[PDB]
Amino acid sequence: PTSLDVTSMTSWEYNWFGADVIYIAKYYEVRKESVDVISYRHPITGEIAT
Amino acid sequence: SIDSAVATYEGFSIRVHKYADGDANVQKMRFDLLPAYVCFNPHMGGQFFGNP
Amino acid sequence: SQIVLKKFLPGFMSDLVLAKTVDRQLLAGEINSSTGDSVSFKRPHQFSSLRTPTGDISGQNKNNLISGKATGRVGNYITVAVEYQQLEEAIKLNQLEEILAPVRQRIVTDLETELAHFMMNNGALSLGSPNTPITKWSDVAQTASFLKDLGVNEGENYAVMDPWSAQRLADAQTGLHASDQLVRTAWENAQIPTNFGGIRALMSNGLASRTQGAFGGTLTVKTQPTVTYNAVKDSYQFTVTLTGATASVTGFLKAGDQVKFTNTYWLQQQTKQALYNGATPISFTATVTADANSDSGGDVTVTLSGVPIYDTTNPQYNSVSRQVEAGDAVSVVGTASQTMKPNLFYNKFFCGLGSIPLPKLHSIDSAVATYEGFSIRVHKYADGDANVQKMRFDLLPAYVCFNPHMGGQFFGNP
């Protein structure tokens, strides 16, 4: 079944008739993570490449 | 001149009142909600049990 | 009789030296919402050697391990409140800032008066006869000599006297024979130096005073008290009963009196050897905590601070030459019921002090006023509709006594 987010924000002085709306949200995070970089150092056509 | 806010739980709004008594050095809080009910048509509902 | 100046006349102000000298380091931000209404510290350990021709410790017994505590608790509220008619109060007193000046100083004065009361109620060591004032150089140097003799090193020592004493000491200093700087300073400013006799001397005008309390009759101990280290490892307080007192007197022993046990002497806490005061041994003394009465038969039960530990299974914690036992002879220093202002001498790690922040009351306008590092919460409300405003000021301190054997009272001797 569908469970929607609750905000109690709108309907403030407005007539509501459509109960066929479900509220979905997108959530963003920024994280600092450990990643391993591989340095392909083939001399042909530039050498330093990480 | 009273600190107040609005809470939300499952689409329902609850108001928060925070106030204190000066002489007794006590704080107190109270939470409020006011519901309402109607009955459109009694011929559109009831209680069902397993028949014999 | 109509025009009034906007500048108030000057008033009287006490001085603050007591708060600046006590230890405000160990206890600071420790009574939080998680700790509760009390917190405790640890205590050092002591060990005792066993001497044998060959080191057979078999069956001899070994040093046990006992750990102590030193609990600090909070006090009552320091509250001053006023009420007024705002029509009359706002006649010539704008912004209500006139009240601020003479309330914070009142709060601090009460705090330090009761702090002095606490220290002279809990301090143990005593010196000289109470009647005799301070007159010469030795009367101040004796405190430093005693503190050094006991063995306290880690810390710093102080001594607080009254305005009149310093003048008698500076008058004495004016009689020096070779120090031009000292004589000149005493003659001009009448100011004594910092280190006087090896202990830092201080002068304070606002200092608490106590009443002796009527006593009469050759007192003596009736029942052997319990002074084992197990009992007194948390509070350094013991209860003892007296006999041979007066028939029926209320207020037989007030708070702050010193009871002396004649035949039990102090000990050098490390070397465990008796203390010898040049020509006579030093006797043990303890301070009364709360008021005690005397009932029929002359039986007085009193609570004393400072314990003469003579544990027989834990010899390493001894602090007295011999065990106090029944039939001992005791006496109370001073006269019958005179009132005197004592002089205090103490180490740094003798009494703590702190303050607990207070949150603002909900839906009430407030402010914070700071004075000598103490924050005062002031509130305003208008209870009652008869033009009756109200303001209140709050402060909540906390105290702790670490070791009663590192301070007390002192006077002069003839």
Counting one residue from chain A and one from chain B, the pairs whose CB atoms sit within 8 A come to 10
Computed from CA positions of residues C38, C352, C147, C114, in that sequence, does the dihedral angle turn out positive or negative?
A: negative
C316 in helix, strand or coil?
helix
Report the alpha-carbon distance of residue C286 to residue C319 in Å, rounded: 13
Break chain A down into helix, strand, coil percent, rounded to 5. Answer: 0, 0, 100
Look at the block and give the residue holding tokens 């009647």.
C131
Resolution reached, in Å? 3.7
C63: CB partners within 8 A, 6+ apart: C47, C48, C316
Dihedral sign, CA of C254, C134, C265, C330?
Answer: negative
Q: According to the entry, how was the structure determined? A: cryo-EM
Report yes or no: B28 and B19 within 8 Å, Cβ to Cβ: yes
Helix axes C163-173, C180-188, angle to 10 degrees: 140
Q: In C127-268, which ranges are E strands?
A: 157-161, 195-196, 199-203, 210-211, 220-221, 237-243, 249-253, 258-265
Alpha carbons within 13 A on the beta-carbon side of C84: 14
**Closest by alpha carbon to C126, among C414, C352, C344?**
C344
Taking CA atoms, C180 is separated from C137, C175, C195, in Å, by 18, 11, 17
Which residues 28-47 on chain B approach chain C with CB closer than 8 angstroms?
28
φ, ψ for residue C299, nearest 5 deg: -105, 110
Question: A19 contacts in B (CB within 8 Å)?
Answer: none
CA distance B21 to chain A (A): 32
CA-based nearest distance A30→chain B, Å: 27
Report which of C185, C142, C154, C109 is spatially closest to residue C343, judged by C-alpha positions. C142
Residues C116 and C407: beta-carbon distance below 8 Å: no
Question: CA distances (Å), C302 to each of B18, C278, C403, in order?
Answer: 49, 32, 20
Closest CA to C290 of C239, C220, C333, C234: C239
Helix (H, G, I), strand (E, B) or coil at B38: coil
Do B and A count as touching (3 or more CB pairs closer than 8 A)?
yes
**Rounded to 5°, angle at Cα A23 from A17 and A24:** 160
Residue among C409, C227, C385 at smallest CA distance from C319? C227
For C165-199, give one letter per residue: b (16+ CB within 10 A) or e.
bbebbbeebeeeeeeeeeeebbeeeeebeeebbeb
Chains that touch C (3 or more CB pairs under 8 A): B
**Phi, psi dihedrals of residue C165, rounded to the nearest 5°:** -60, -50
- Concatenating the DSSP letter of every residue in C49-81 gives ----SS---TTT---------EEEEE-----EE
**Which residue type does C355 have?**
S
- Which H/E stretch holds residue C300? strand C300-305
Half-sphere exposure of C326 (CA within 13 A, CB side): 3
Radius of gyration of the CA atoms of chain A, in A: 26
Q: Which residue of A has its CA nearest to B9?
A: A6
Cα dist. A37→A34, A42, A49, A50 in Å?
10, 15, 10, 6
Contact, C333 vs C129, CB < 8 A? yes
CA distance B33 to chain A (A): 14
Cα A43 to chain centroid, rounded:
39
Polymer length of chain A: 50
**∠ CA C364-B23-C355 to the nearest 5 degrees?**
80
- The tokens describing C172, both together, are 């004495």
Choose among C100, C80, C109, C102: nearest CA to C17. Answer: C109
Residues from B contacting A (CB-CB < 8 Å) are 6, 8-13
CB C191 within 8 A of CB C376: no
- Asked if the C-beta of C76 comes within 8 angstroms of chain B's C-beta atoms, the answer is no
C342, with CB counted inside 10 A (0-12, 13-18, 19+), is: buried
Interface test with C, best of B21, B26, B29, B30 (most C CBs within 10 A): B21
Q: Report residue C12 as tokens.
A: 């009287």
